[PDB]
Amino acid sequence: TGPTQRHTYYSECDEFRFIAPRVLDEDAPPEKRAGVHDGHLKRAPKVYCGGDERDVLRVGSGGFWPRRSRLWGGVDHAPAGFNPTVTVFHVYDILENVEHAYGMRAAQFHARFMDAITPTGTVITLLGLTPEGHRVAVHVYGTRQYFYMNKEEVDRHLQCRAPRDLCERMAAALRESPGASFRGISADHFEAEVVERTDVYYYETRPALFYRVYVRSGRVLSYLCDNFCPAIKKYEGGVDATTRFILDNPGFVTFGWYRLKPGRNNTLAQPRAPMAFGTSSDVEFNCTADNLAIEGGMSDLPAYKLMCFDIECKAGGEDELAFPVAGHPEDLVIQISCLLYDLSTTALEHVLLFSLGSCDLPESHLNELAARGLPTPVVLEFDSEFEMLLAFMTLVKQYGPEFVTGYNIINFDWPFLLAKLTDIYKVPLDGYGRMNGRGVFRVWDIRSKIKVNGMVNIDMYGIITDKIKLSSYKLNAVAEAVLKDKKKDLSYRDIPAYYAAGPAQRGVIGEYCIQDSLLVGQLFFKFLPHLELSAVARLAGINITRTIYDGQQIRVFTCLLRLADQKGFILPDTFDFASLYPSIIQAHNLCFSTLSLRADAVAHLEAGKDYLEIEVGGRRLFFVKAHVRESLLSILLRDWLAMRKQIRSRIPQSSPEEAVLLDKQQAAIKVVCNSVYGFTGVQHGLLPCLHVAATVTTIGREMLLAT
DNA sequence: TCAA
Ligand SMILES: [Ca+2]
Ligand SMILES: [Ca+2]
DSSP states (O other): OOOOSSOOOSSOOEEEEEEEEEEEEEEEESSSSSEEEEEEEEEEOOOTTTTEEEEETSSSTTOOOOOOOOTTTTEEEETTTTOOOOOOOEEEEEEEEEEEEETTTTSSHHHHHHOOOOOOSEEEEEEEETTTTEEEEEEEEOOOOOEEEHHHHHHSSSOOOOHHHHHHHHHHHHSSSSSGGGTTTGGGGGEEEEEEEEEESSHHHHEEEEEEESSSOOHHHHHHHHHHHHOOOOTTTOOOOOHHHHHSSOOOOEEEEEEEEETTTSOOEOOOGGGGBBBBBHHHHHHHHGGGGEEOOOOOOOOOOOEEEEEEEEOSSOOOTTTOTTTTTTSSEEEEEEEEEEETTOOOHHHHHHHEEOOOOOHHHHHHHHTTTTOOOOEEESSHHHHHHHHHHHHHHOOOOOOOSSSSSIIIIHHHHHIIIIIIIIOTTTSSSSSSSSSOOOEOOEEEEEEEEEEEEHHHHHHHHHHHSSOOHHHHHHIIIIOOOOOOOTTTTTTHHHHOOOOOHHHHHHHHHHHHHHHHHHHHHHHHHHHHHHHHHHHHSSHHHHHHOSSSHHHHHHHHHHHHHHHHEEEOOOOOOHHHHHHHHHHHOTTTTEESSSGGTTTTBBBBBTTTEETTTTEEEEOTTTOOOOOOOHHHHHHHHHHHHHHHGGGGGSSSHHHHHHHHHHHHHHHTTTHHHHHHTTTTTSSSSSSHHHHHHHHHHHHHOOO
């Protein structure tokens, strides 16, 4: 039988491109000891360790690196009768995928889940850990994206008279799509209802009837928002399924503790069978949102794993002092240091060094690590670059570190590794994250960004350049400054000579690779960047990976979206002063919804008493005061500032451990409050209002001159 | 210069 959906990572391999420096051939005469061998070898990839040899892709008892994987290539390696009971689990990341009832027909899913994916549906996967350290995926069914269109405008443009009509019109526009990428679409793929809402822009704007349209897939939604009736303004078509799951279930969070519970008709979460697992988890469940609750009182982070890594590269062309380029076959990765920490206890658990060629670490370095009370390094030796890179990616899949760190890993180390795997070796990456295939594993340039499904990448270079002012942000300099530690260093121009000289000299390169990763680990546990990022994720209502890589706008957008829905609004698609701009927004009740550009909008009100009027950018603007209508931006700011004041009142009486968590929380509220002015001012952003931004600066200027 |  094997897995329901195919695993796309390598579980077997029997031929590969063998690339290796000729200088590793100790018996060869000097003329044959320069350059790189490059050819295809009919062999299983191998790793050597401490005199022993293994195939890289063999899973069994005697492995050279740790594993946290149940399945490998469709074989279950858990003990006989392994069946943990799961009540509470922590979520650190949320995936969003499409499933089809036809694809899942062989999996023994209950009918209530199959209905939610018939003929297709969006599944929300909560990625997490139990208190016992078991890796969990909880697949939540029944979440649908939805958008709005004005009822009268649709009724005149498409001649609709009942909601069923619009479902046909949309199905037609998809059937008629270029290349027929939306073959098989029908009115069953849709639901439409009539609801009363107000456009969030302007004070005079009246409530109106809208079609709220539900859809099964973001692929369909993005086609409709780009192509269906361009003359008709869409509302909230940009909102992802994760955001709907979080906002439509009061209290739910993208990072935190959850509990499984009985649903509405006493329904339960169903454990998946192993051959229906979508991820590299120990246990997986199908559930609906009513099977979930936020677990109160639990606050400790569970035993997530942090990988801290650094690569070392050697240029192989006619100038070994040229900077290495991944696209050149001869410019090799030669070493990868890889430190594995428990993120809850901060303890270093494993020190792995991957090495192209034999490598004997200095006794000096081994003694120092032993004196520091750290794990003895395991050196993994490879005959070729491919075998080493495959082994590293195999470790990433099998150990599955939830958090990954390093220095310049986003701008250099991942881009270099992934370019080798993709361009030189033709390896598919979509199975190497948490998902077993078809997952996101992507690098792109702006400096760079990364998305790996189920892996939170945190580059320490970004953290430190944001936190500390320094002349130089080289790691050696940062270390001297922040950790008061003066390490010894190898330059890129030492590496060619050390590499050619022999095993002991390649050992010196490894010592340096390991001490580099040890310093970065110390930086990480000093600044605790996962705690500030998770505090922002919880406050903003977005996942921690979106928190790192997306901009400031999505944080304010998601909070505004929550409040706007509660108030009946919908969002259309596109001496010193303490907190000057937030406090102007609050004191003057400035908002999208309190603004008027027209005098007749405020003719029923009294000037000064019921509204501000102000000249801004040459135009007369009106803002009604809070007793007429309270600003959404003002409410956000007020509630956040009240929350921050509450948190900071508790810090002096709290435990030394609690004080850290509270400090990260109060800091998260500051960064979000300060981004509100900016959010209004980004032209072509999410929900721009340049009138509000320009009013804030006009008031600010006048306050200084008044003072 | 800075990224190996
Ligand atoms: Ca390096
Ligand atoms: Ca690095």
